[PDB]
Amino acid sequence: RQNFAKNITTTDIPKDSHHFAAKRSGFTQTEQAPFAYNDVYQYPKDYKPWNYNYKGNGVLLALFLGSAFSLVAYERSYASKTGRYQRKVQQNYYQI
Amino acid sequence: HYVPDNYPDALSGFRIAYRDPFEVQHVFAYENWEYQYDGQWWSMGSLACNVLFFCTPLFLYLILQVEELNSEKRGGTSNKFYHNNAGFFHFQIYDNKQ
Amino acid sequence: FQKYPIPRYLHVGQWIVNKNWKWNTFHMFFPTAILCFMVWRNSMISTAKPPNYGEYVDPQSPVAPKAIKY
Amino acid sequence: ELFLNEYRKRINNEVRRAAILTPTSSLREKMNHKIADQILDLSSPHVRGAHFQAVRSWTDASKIVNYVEEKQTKINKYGLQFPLLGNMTEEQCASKEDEVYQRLLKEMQKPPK
Amino acid sequence: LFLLFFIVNLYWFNSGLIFFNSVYKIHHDAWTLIFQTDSILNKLKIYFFLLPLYISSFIHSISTWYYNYILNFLLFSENLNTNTNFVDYITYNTLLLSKFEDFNLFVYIKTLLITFDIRQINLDFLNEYPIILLTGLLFLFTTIFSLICLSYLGLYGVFILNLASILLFWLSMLYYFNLIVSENYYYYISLGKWMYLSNGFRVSFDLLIDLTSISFSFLTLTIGVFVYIYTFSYFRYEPLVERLILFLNSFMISMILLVSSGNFIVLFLGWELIGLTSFFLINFWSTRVGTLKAAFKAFSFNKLSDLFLFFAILIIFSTTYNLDILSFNNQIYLYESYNIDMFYWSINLIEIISFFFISCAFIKSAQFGAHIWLPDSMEAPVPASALIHSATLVSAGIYLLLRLSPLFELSKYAYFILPLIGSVTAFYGGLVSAFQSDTKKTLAYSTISHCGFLMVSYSTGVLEFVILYLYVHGFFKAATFLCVGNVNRFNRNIQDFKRMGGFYKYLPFECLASFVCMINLSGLPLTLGFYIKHLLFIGLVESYTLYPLIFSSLILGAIAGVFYSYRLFYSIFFDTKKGKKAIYLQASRIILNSKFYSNTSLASNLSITFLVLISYTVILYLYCTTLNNYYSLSDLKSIYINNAYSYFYKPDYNFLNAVSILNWFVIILLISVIYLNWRWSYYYTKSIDSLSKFILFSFFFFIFSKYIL
Amino acid sequence: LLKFDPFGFYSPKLLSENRPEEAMPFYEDYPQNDSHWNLWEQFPEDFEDSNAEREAILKSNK
Amino acid sequence: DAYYHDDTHEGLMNEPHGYLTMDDPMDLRPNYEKSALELLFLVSGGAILALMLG
Amino acid sequence: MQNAYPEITDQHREFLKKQGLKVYEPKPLPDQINPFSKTYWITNAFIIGVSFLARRHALKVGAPRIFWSGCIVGVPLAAIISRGKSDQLDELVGARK
Amino acid sequence: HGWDRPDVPLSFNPLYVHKRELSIFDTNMWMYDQVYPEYVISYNEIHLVDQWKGLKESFSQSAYWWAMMAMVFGFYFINTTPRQLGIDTNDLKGFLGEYYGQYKKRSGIRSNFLGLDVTGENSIIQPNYDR
Amino acid sequence: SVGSLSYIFYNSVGGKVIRDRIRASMPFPKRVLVQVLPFVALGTALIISRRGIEGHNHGYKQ
Amino acid sequence: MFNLNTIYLSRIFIEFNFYFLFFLFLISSIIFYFSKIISIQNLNQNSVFNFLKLANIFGILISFFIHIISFWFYCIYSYNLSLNIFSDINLYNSNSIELLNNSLLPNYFKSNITIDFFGLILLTLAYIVGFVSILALDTRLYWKNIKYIFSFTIFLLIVYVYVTVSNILLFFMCYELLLIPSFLIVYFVSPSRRAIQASLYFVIWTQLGSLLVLIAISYIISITNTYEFNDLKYFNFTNSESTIIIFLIFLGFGFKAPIWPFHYWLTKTHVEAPSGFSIYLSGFLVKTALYGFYKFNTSIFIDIDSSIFIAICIMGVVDSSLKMWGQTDLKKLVAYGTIQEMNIIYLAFCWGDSCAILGGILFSATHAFLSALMFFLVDCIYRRYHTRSLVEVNGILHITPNLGLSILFMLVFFSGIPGTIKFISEFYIFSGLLEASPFICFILMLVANVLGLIGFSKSWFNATFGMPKKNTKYLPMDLSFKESYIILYCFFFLFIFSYFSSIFF
Ligand SMILES: Nc1ncnc2c1ncn2[C@@H]1O[C@H](COP(=O)(O)OP(=O)(O)O)[C@@H](O)[C@H]1O
């Protein structure tokens, strides 16, 4: 079975302490003991379980930077393979 | 039957139910099915179909030989080990050491 | 058919209606249109069209198909 | 062998271009001029194509490689290998370019035929 | 504050640039007035009047080196700028005033503003580059995204996105299709290399836009727009109606891509996509395993067709090693005199490839032995069946045969196979439709008959008749299928007409539309159907060995449509109340009586009306371009032109009498269906009296109108 | 299936993740995703892990 | 239709629902399987773009 | 390589020119179509800016933005692909090299 | 309307209790489904007993339609004359002329362009000038 | 290796909500280091590989 | 522009990847052995099992990325060397580039590194397959069974050593070592009780194939007392010797292919073995055997007719495809499809050193990817529905939409759709066959692409759709993000793999 530590310390688990209340008075002679722990997990208000919540820009920025580097390298390689220091711009371009 | 000391696969909460006996019998049917009499494997099902299936490798060999003869008639690619590379592997780096 | 309850945990698309469908549609239309324009430019970069009406292909031009010289 | 396949592909590309360049009213005669002869020359017997093995004689392979070598000699006679078909260092490339300039001057300095 | 400072700085920079360009143009003060000889007053004037110009240069000295540094970081080249020390290079670049030479800030801003102007669109650019590629890409991407983003956008959002994409695609194809049909446009668009096929061979993803492709795409797109407009009506409370619409959009996109094939790989990809789309679409009720059997049968048939097509394409490639369809059509005549040693037989090169193509078409375009999957494919929804039966899955074979027209021209196996098979299939489909009580089954059998007739027309050797028949049959079958689906929806998913009746009073719009569609589709006289039937009968060749059976089957399949159409119309609309009392009485409550009462959806009715009008207009335009005295059709790329057009231009009295005999058989069938008393009635004697009076009046009118007056 | 809720998104999910039975152990509930490829127990950076109470007791007894 | 209850009155016209995957959004275990898979995918994409695109 | 076509005469060419015909010749691609065009570069820059603005708006509204991110990433990728198509020495139907 | 109809009953997808052993002798011969499993193929014409009997019945019934077709063909052939149809007579060098030209060309019987001594006959798909 | 270790150690905090909350409750330099470092190392390695794999340094250029 | 840096970079990259893998394996072994006396998996929060597993996964990923970069460099170097040999025209100069050995690490087994493109393809495919198998092996390893965690790295190291050596003895020894890890995994990780006899049969068949291959290799070595392929080319074998060598190599490789009727071991293994092992066993071992057969066959010139081998491959393909309609077990059907694909692939290289190897390599890669996808789907189903037969599980798409969509996409890919690399490989192989035997090619296309395909689809479709009314209170959940990412990666590999440069294809 699972042997990890559930009570994490890297952050605080958001919990709603008002959902469940433990009985503390007027228990019947044969009544059962109330639950000691009644805290319920509290999810973020604007988190959609139906869609990915990743709203960051790091992945898109990295992809754009990689594409730009690839384009620059392609330009440099086209210049070098043609024996020119920089890309020579043709006067007219026609379809192939 | 589970292997000795089999660690339970508790995916999806380890919520499994009792299987249908007929379903289990059908699942474990082919792996246990066997012929009852020697030679009964031939006449089982369709005799002509079984004969054709068992003779298929010979028919395939004969067809391949006929096709090879036809190719030899027109000088096409033959079922021969064409060692045209003299043993040098495709794109095999051939460099010497200092 | 009369609508019946479906599991909220189940990721089903059975008669799913979104109140904010307008903004989602606008967002999925605009960037898609931009990508389509870029792809159209890329595809029209290399295109072949029949010669215009009244224009005849002089066979001496390199545009005419060439033959492999042995 | 790949170059023979490329020649067949060039003939096919020429046919495809003439398809868009010439209308069906005059495409037949235009193709019957010369193109169909080269298409028939560049066929399965002469080109490996889809055949897994190009079954040719030893002398046939010798002649094919000889023609390829003649084409290579013609291409490198103008220093066209760099950088598409030849990896040449700076000094070697410069010397070859100077020799090519001299050879081009000599060739263009000849009387017409 | 900031805005005022920016305005002042911009004005100063513009004035300085104007002065510099005005002084550096003559090449005299470009360095003299700029680089004044010390003279601290002159230095202050130069760095105070050109300060807006100078500062940018210093700014230009900042980003450039850094960018160069980025280059040195990103390329490990240029050796950075070790020649300088960042204090001389900056000073030189900042002090070099030739950078702002002949540069106008106002001109640059105005040009950038003019770079987003649409007023300079012009029409020649549209002629030079068909924007329909952008529309098709948008439609495909919208369908893919809606499949991927079915949750973010609701049913309304998905419908709006799909409708917008499809309407843009349909609008794009209108002018371009008109130009292709009339101005004789052709195109080959290569979307880069696609896949390596042989050693050194890299086939490119190319598409061929031709007249046949344009016509097929236009017809399919119009039908799909009409269905998607009406599909929302039928699947009103459907659990996955957006899913059904998305599947329909995917199928339409696959059909359009298949019709726009440019290479043999593209045709195979299109066929595979059409097969997969049909397999998934038929599986509308995945929870139902009964339809799964029909879906499996259809998938098996499509896979067999795909295997046959792959074998044919492999043979063609082994023969020529060229995947370009245009080049192959331009080179198909080369290797006609050749054979391939298969097993112990030696068949001609054209014969085997043609047989494979014909078999693959017969598997797709339902023929004898392969039409079983077509009738069983009725388990799909109403719009799905309307799309599949009218075109695409049904029009694949005709389009494939027309695309490879030169290849099919010189095949003896095709010569003997096409006429007999087409006539037999048409006759069988007509006879089957004449006996089907289910609306879906009757429509499928009529579609099979129409496919057989189209195959027979393809055997005639005239492409224009085939194209006209395809367009008219597709439009009319789509309309009829929509009407039948609406009737079934009113009947609570009941397709059989044996338990239907009295629906004309319930659905007047549906009754009238069904009447018009049955008049057009059934080949009835005095319509597009009659014209198509006459054209098909004109072009028959008499050299066929099985000519008698072929002619008999053609006549029988031609005569059978009217009976089925009339039977369906009368049974659904004007027969006895054979439907359940619940279907009528529940809507017969007085409470429902209001200004919005309707047995069908107003959106569906309007879509049907618009589709019918557009189809009529397009058919009129096609008849004008083709059937008129002046042949306005572009080059069909066919070198085999028959003299059958002479009969259409000027026939003899023999063909006139043959057509008269056919019309007389049709009129006899109409009279029989008009007065046959299949059941006893209060007016059975009155029906006989009416029929006798009609016969007498017709005789009198024939006598008086031709001889008396 | 209607009452099913694995992540406790539509309905509150107690931290105990179960109501312990009066005669059954309060063992941890089986997670829906049983991926055992979990990294080492990660504590926050610069965490004081010295035994504070034990150090206080050592100071007291010394 | 005759009596078509709009989404305001419809008790069964569902909005977005259903979990994207079986993973718990509030999981506390330091699982790295999804992160490793994303890293592998991103590495493949970057390697394709950086030295093979042009 | 050879011309591959049946030769004609300049006198016949002039005679046809007197009739109003033309010889179809390649034309330069419009700046909107040219991948080496300032118009293409400005269009890419404007598209990138609008994509960033739309990403912000979708973050404010929750609408899908993966399509915008893909379009922005492909903005340089599309230019690279077009330039690669242009720089190739092979020809299919276009002007001869 | 007028009746608060409950939710759709679960009986709409009844669970099938397999009463007969699905023997391995019929593997994949029955489409299995937790609700209403079916046979792999459907024979809605079960009134016809066997394939041979069904074929005999179909051939017996098709005789009437064959006779009707024969009657139509006879009525057409006894009331019509042969027509004048064919390829375009003014164009003899097209589909017709090209065939004879190719049959007179026989370029597939020439020598190799490089002297390889291999002709079109040296192929599985070999040219044949006398088909 | 550094990029793989950093990305694993930065995005494998737990569930989606746990990762979001933890990354939110982090210093701005800490967030930048978590973001920049894993991508920066991979990008630099890719740049070095691309530079090595090409021959742009040839001196016979004009 | 081809400088000596590229060759040196490629050689150093290969050597460094091998040495880094060796160092990681040594570190992991030291950690595992020296952190516990019994070396059992610690059933506690602080355990070395998590650290060892993370180390193995991260090392595999890093080595895969480094191997991708090194394989790109090696392809560039091979293209440059091939051009340079073809570049030289004047007879005065010849290709003479003598490189020195690196100082940081020594040569593996004191042998120089030789590079082939097929070796790099096999290494990359094996790396990806082993990563997938290890990711799917989480639910199998437990206390006292965590020792098998590093077996995949050992197999990867063996493959790297084999695909970089030029000695036939080294190649044969490396090819023989993989049997022990496979037997150990089968005997200790399989959950099925019937898997004992299955493992025994698999070991027996693999040992028979190894014995045949070893007899052939010993004959070859004794015939010419040398250990170089160049020296082998410098010698000619007699007619009987060549025939016997070819027959023995074919028999061993076909027993390890597998081929009919030596496919009972493969069938039983795929029926009973653990999902991760079966994914790795089908993905890698068959490819290694094919690569060995191709390497040995090219190095030996044979004048005999390949009709026997071609007919054997065709008959095996036909037999594997025909049995699909009767397979109700998803694993069994996937095994039959994989057997058919393996027979088709082995059919390609029967034309000797002709231009048929590229199609075989492409088909091997496509089959590996498809088999990986199918095994992952089967494993996910057996984890969710706790079953592998279609009779007890139906209507998956109704309760598992993502799984149903993935299954449909996998079926579409397995159909050899035009966009997939299976289409290109099928086109090449069918073109070669029709060039040799047209009717045989048409028959092969008719059977596998339709009959076996129809059977696989009907078996897959019946489970794909339906209504899972059974076991309502125990219904399974949707696929985890790990499985979704694995499926996406597999699809991306299958699709984008067709866009690779044609210099090698
Ligand atoms: N596993 C099976 N073996 C043999 N026959 C079967 C099997 N499953 C279904 N059938 C056939 O399908 C028909 C349907 O049976 P079913 O309706 O379940 O039984 P009942 O009619 O008693 O309810 C039966 O007549 C039976 O012959």
What gap in Å lies between CA E18 and CA I112, rounded to an integer?
72
Asked if I91 and D20 count as a contact pair (C-beta separation under 8 A), the reply is no
Say which amino acid occupies I27. Answer: T
Asked if B33 and B44 count as a contact pair (C-beta separation under 8 A), the reply is no
Conformational region of residue E79, where left means phi above 0, alpha means psi within -120 to 50, and beta covers everything else? left
Q: Which of I15, I17, I18, I19 to mutate to test the pocket of ligand 1 (most atoms within 8 A of CB)?
A: I19
Interface test with K, best of G33, G39, G41, G42 (most K CBs within 10 A): G33
Query: How many residues does the structure list for chain C?
Result: 70
Could you tell me how far CA A5 lies from the centroid of its own chain? 22
Contacts 24+ apart (CB under 8 A), F21-30: F22/A32, F22/A33, F27/A1, F28/A1, F28/A2, F28/A6, F29/B13, F30/A1, F30/A2, F30/B10, F30/B13, F30/B14
- K390 Cβ partners below 8 Å, 6+ apart? I32, K328, K329, K330, K459, K462, K463
Pairing type for strands B96-97 and E201-209 reads: unpaired
CB contact under 8 A, A51 and E151: yes
CB contact under 8 A, I18 and B25: no
- K206 Cβ partners below 8 Å, 6+ apart? K179, K182, K255, K256, K265
User: Phi then psi for K43, rounded to 5 degrees?
Assistant: -85, 65
With tokens 């694949």, the residue in question is: E396
Q: How far is CA C34 from CA E189, H51, K86, in A?
A: 20, 9, 47
Pairing type for strands B96-97 and K98-99 reads: parallel
Pairing type for strands E201-209 and E338-342 reads: unpaired
Asked if E582 and E499 count as a contact pair (C-beta separation under 8 A), the reply is no
- A87 Cβ partners below 8 Å, 6+ apart? A75, A78, A79
Sheet order of strands, A15-16 included: A15-16, A40-41, F13-14
What gap in Å lies between CA D57 and CA E549, rounded to an integer?
56
What gap in Å lies between CA K481 and CA G34, rounded to an integer?
6
Residue K147 has a CB neighbour count (10 Å cut-off) of 17
Q: What is the DSSP string of E255-271?
A: HHHHHTB-BHHHHHHHH
Asked if K189 and K274 count as a contact pair (C-beta separation under 8 A), the reply is yes
Partner H, chain G 34-53, Cβ-Cβ below 8 Å: 53
Alpha helices in E183-260 (DSSP H): 211-234, 241-259
Q: Is B58 on the interface with I (CB under 8 A)?
A: no
Q: How far is CA H40 from CA C42, H32, H79, in A?
A: 11, 6, 8
Provide the experimental method for this PDB entry: cryo-EM
With tokens 């006139």, the residue in question is: E656
HSE of A17, CA atoms in CB hemisphere, 13 A: 2
Say which amino acid occupies J44. Answer: T
Conformational region of residue E575, where left means phi above 0, alpha means psi within -120 to 50, and beta covers everything else? beta
Say which amino acid occupies I24. Answer: I
With tokens 């300095």, the residue in question is: D109
Q: Do the chains F and H touch each other, judged by at least 3 C-beta pairs below 8 angstroms?
A: no
What are I37's two structure tokens?
A: 């499993």
Print the SS3 string covering K200-240.
Answer: HHHHHHHHHHHHHHHHHHHHHHHHCCCCCHHHHHCCCCCHH
What gap in Å lies between CA C62 and CA E439, rounded to an integer?
61
The SS3 of residue E106 is helix
The SS3 of residue K260 is coil
Report the b/e string of C25-63 with b at 16+ CB within 10 A: bbbbbbbbbbbbbbbbbbbbbbbbbbbeeeebbbbebeb
Q: Which residue of I has its CA nearest to B27?
A: I24
Q: Is H6 on the interface with D (CB under 8 A)?
A: yes
Asked if H97 and H89 count as a contact pair (C-beta separation under 8 A), the reply is yes
What are I77's two structure tokens?
A: 């052939």
What gap in Å lies between CA E193 and CA H85, rounded to an integer?
10
With the CA atoms of E605, E609, E611 and E613 taken in that order, what torsion angle do they form, in degrees rounded to the nearest 10? Answer: 180
Q: What is the DSSP string of G1-54?
A: -TT---TTT-TT-B-S-S-SSSS-TT--S-B-HHHHHHHHHHHHHHHHHHHH--
Asked if E602 and E551 count as a contact pair (C-beta separation under 8 A), the reply is no
Beta strands in D3-111 (DSSP E): none
With the CA atoms of K485, K491, K492 and K496 taken in that order, what torsion angle do they form, in degrees rounded to the nearest 10? Answer: 170
- K322 Cβ partners below 8 Å, 6+ apart? K447, K451, K452
- K230 Cβ partners below 8 Å, 6+ apart? B87
Query: What is the radius of gyration, based on Cα positions, of chain G?
Result: 22
Ligand 1 within 6 A of I22 CB?
yes
What are K145's two structure tokens?
A: 């069974």
The SS3 of residue E352 is helix
Asked if E396 and E271 count as a contact pair (C-beta separation under 8 A), the reply is yes
What gap in Å lies between CA H83 and CA I9, rounded to an integer?
63
Q: Which residue of K has its CA nearest to E298?
A: K454
What are K498's two structure tokens?
A: 């067709």
What gap in Å lies between CA E390 and CA E255, rounded to an integer?
12
Alpha helices in E377-493 (DSSP H): 382-390, 396-403, 405-409, 412-433, 439-460, 463-490
With tokens 């043979």, the residue in question is: E315
What gap in Å lies between CA H59 and CA A54, rounded to an integer?
11
Asked if E229 and E612 count as a contact pair (C-beta separation under 8 A), the reply is no
What gap in Å lies between CA K267 and CA K275, rounded to an integer?
14
Rounded to 5°, the CA angle E67-E73-E78 comes to 75
Asked if K130 and K278 count as a contact pair (C-beta separation under 8 A), the reply is no
Q: How far is CA E247 from CA A50, C21, E243, E489, K401, in A?
A: 22, 20, 6, 20, 16
The SS3 of residue J62 is coil
| I16 among annotated binding-site residues | yes
Which one of E112, E125, E145 has the shortest CB-CB distance to H30? Answer: E125
Q: How many angstroms separate the alpha carbon of residue I36 from the centre of ligand 1? A: 11
Q: How far is CA K43 from CA B64, E433, K52, K142, in A?
A: 61, 73, 14, 9
- The secondary structure of residue F27, as a DSSP letter, is P
Say which amino acid occupies C47. Answer: T
Which chain I residues contact residue C14 at CB under 8 A?
none
Interface test with F, best of C9, C11, C12 (most F CBs within 10 A): C9
Q: How far is CA K200 from CA K179, K214, K255, in A?
A: 12, 20, 15
Partner G, chain J 18-57, Cβ-Cβ below 8 Å: 18, 42-43, 46-47, 49-50, 53
Sheet order of strands, E187-198 included: C47-48, E187-198, E201-209
Q: Of A21, A5, A12, which Cα lies nearest the Cα of A41? A: A12
By 3-state DSSP, what share of chain E in percent is helix, strand and coil, each rounded to 5? 70, 5, 25
Q: Which H helix or E strand runs over E348?
A: strand E345-348
With tokens 């050796």, the residue in question is: E79
| I104 among annotated binding-site residues | no
Asked if E310 and E410 count as a contact pair (C-beta separation under 8 A), the reply is no
Alpha helices in F1-62 (DSSP H): 52-61
Task: Tell me the CA end-to-end span of chain D in Å, nearest whole number.
Answer: 34
Asked if K152 and K60 count as a contact pair (C-beta separation under 8 A), the reply is yes
What gap in Å lies between CA G32 and CA G23, rounded to an integer?
12
What are D45's two structure tokens?
A: 């017997």
What gap in Å lies between CA K429 and CA K431, rounded to an integer?
5
Which one of A10, A13, A49 has the shortest CB-CB distance to F42? Answer: A10
- A38 Cβ partners below 8 Å, 6+ apart? A17, A19, A20, A21, A22, F14, F16
- E16 Cβ partners below 8 Å, 6+ apart? E49, E50, E51, E52, E53
With tokens 């504070």, the residue in question is: F52
Q: List, in sequence order, every residue forming a beta bridge with C55; answer none if it has no partner.
A: H22
Query: How many residues does the structure list for chain J?
Result: 62
What gap in Å lies between CA E393 and CA E374, rounded to an integer?
9
What gap in Å lies between CA E53 and CA B92, rounded to an integer?
61
- Please name the residue whose Cα sits nearest to atom 26 of ligand 1: I20
Q: How many angstroms separate the alpha carbon of residue I38 from the centre of ligand 1? A: 9
User: Phi then psi for K415, rounded to 5 degrees?
Assistant: -70, 0
Q: How many angstroms separate the alpha carbon of residue I22 from the centre of ligand 1? A: 10
What gap in Å lies between CA E30 and CA C66, rounded to an integer?
52
CB contact under 8 A, B33 and I27: no
User: Phi then psi for K249, rounded to 5 degrees?
Assistant: -60, -45
Rounded to 5°, the CA angle E241-E247-E252 comes to 125
Q: How many angstroms separate the alpha carbon of residue C53 from the centre of ligand 1? A: 72
Q: Of K467, K280, K468, which Cα lies nearest the Cα of K379? A: K280
Residue I81 has a CB neighbour count (10 Å cut-off) of 10
What gap in Å lies between CA E395 and CA E379, rounded to an integer?
20
Q: Which H helix or E strand runs over E462?
A: none
What gap in Å lies between CA G39 and CA G41, rounded to an integer?
5
Contacts 24+ apart (CB under 8 A), E80-84: none
Could you tell me how far CA J51 lies from the centroid of its own chain? 18
Q: Which residue of D has its CA nearest to A81?
A: D83
Ligand 1 within 6 A of I31 CB?
no
- Please name the residue whose Cα sits nearest to atom 22 of ligand 1: I19
Could you tell me how far CA E560 lies from the centroid of its own chain? 29
- E516 Cβ partners below 8 Å, 6+ apart? E479, E612
Asked if K364 and K312 count as a contact pair (C-beta separation under 8 A), the reply is no
What gap in Å lies between CA K160 and CA K122, rounded to an integer?
9
Task: Tell me the CA end-to-end span of chain G in Å, nearest whole number.
Answer: 59
- E609 Cβ partners below 8 Å, 6+ apart? E513
Q: List, in sequence order, every residue forming a beta bridge with E496; answer none if it has no partner.
A: E438
What gap in Å lies between CA E106 and CA D105, rounded to an integer?
52
Q: How far is CA K366 from CA K117, K369, K424, K443, in A?
A: 16, 5, 10, 22
- The secondary structure of residue E579, as a DSSP letter, is S
Q: Is C54 on the interface with D (CB under 8 A)?
A: no
Q: How many angstroms separate the alpha carbon of residue I35 from the centre of ligand 1? A: 13
Asked if K245 and K333 count as a contact pair (C-beta separation under 8 A), the reply is no
Q: How far is H64 from chain E (nearest CA, A)?
A: 7
Largest CA distance in chain K: 84
Q: Is G18 on the interface with C (CB under 8 A)?
A: yes
Q: How far is E341 from chain B (nearest CA, A)?
A: 7
What are F31's two structure tokens?
A: 């997670």
Say which amino acid occupies K372. Answer: A
Largest CA distance in chain A: 99
Q: How many angstroms separate the alpha carbon of residue I39 from the centre of ligand 1? A: 10
With the CA atoms of E267, E270, E271 and E273 taken in that order, what torsion angle do they form, in degrees rounded to the nearest 10? Answer: 160
- Please name the residue whose Cα sits nearest to atom 9 of ligand 1: I20
What gap in Å lies between CA K428 and CA K355, rounded to an integer?
10
Q: Of B88, D49, B67, which Cα lies nearest the Cα of K353? A: B88
What are D73's two structure tokens?
A: 């000699």
Q: Of E100, E114, E110, E92, which Cα lies nearest the Cα of E15? A: E100
Q: How many angstroms separate the alpha carbon of residue H9 from the centre of ligand 1? A: 86
Whether the CA torsion I40, I44, I49, I55 is positive or negative: it is negative
- E562 Cβ partners below 8 Å, 6+ apart? E522, E523, E524, E666, E669, E670, E673
Partner D, chain C 12-31, Cβ-Cβ below 8 Å: none
- Please return the burial class of E685, using the count of CB atoms within 10 Å of its CB with bins 0-12, 13-18 and 19+: exposed
Q: Of K356, K501, K361, D14, which Cα lies nearest the Cα of E322? A: D14
With tokens 């006759």, the residue in question is: E427
Asked if K359 and K432 count as a contact pair (C-beta separation under 8 A), the reply is yes
What are K147's two structure tokens?
A: 């020792």
Say which amino acid occupies F21. Answer: E
Interface test with E, best of B70, B73, B78 (most E CBs within 10 A): B70
Asked if C68 and D10 count as a contact pair (C-beta separation under 8 A), the reply is yes
Print the SS3 string covering E53-68.
Answer: HHHHHHHHHHHHHHHH
Could you tell me how far CA K57 lies from the centroid of its own chain? 19
Rounded to 5°, the CA angle B29-B32-B35 comes to 110
What gap in Å lies between CA B11 and CA D62, rounded to an integer?
66
Q: List, in sequence order, every residue forming a beta bridge with E63; answer none if it has no partner.
A: none
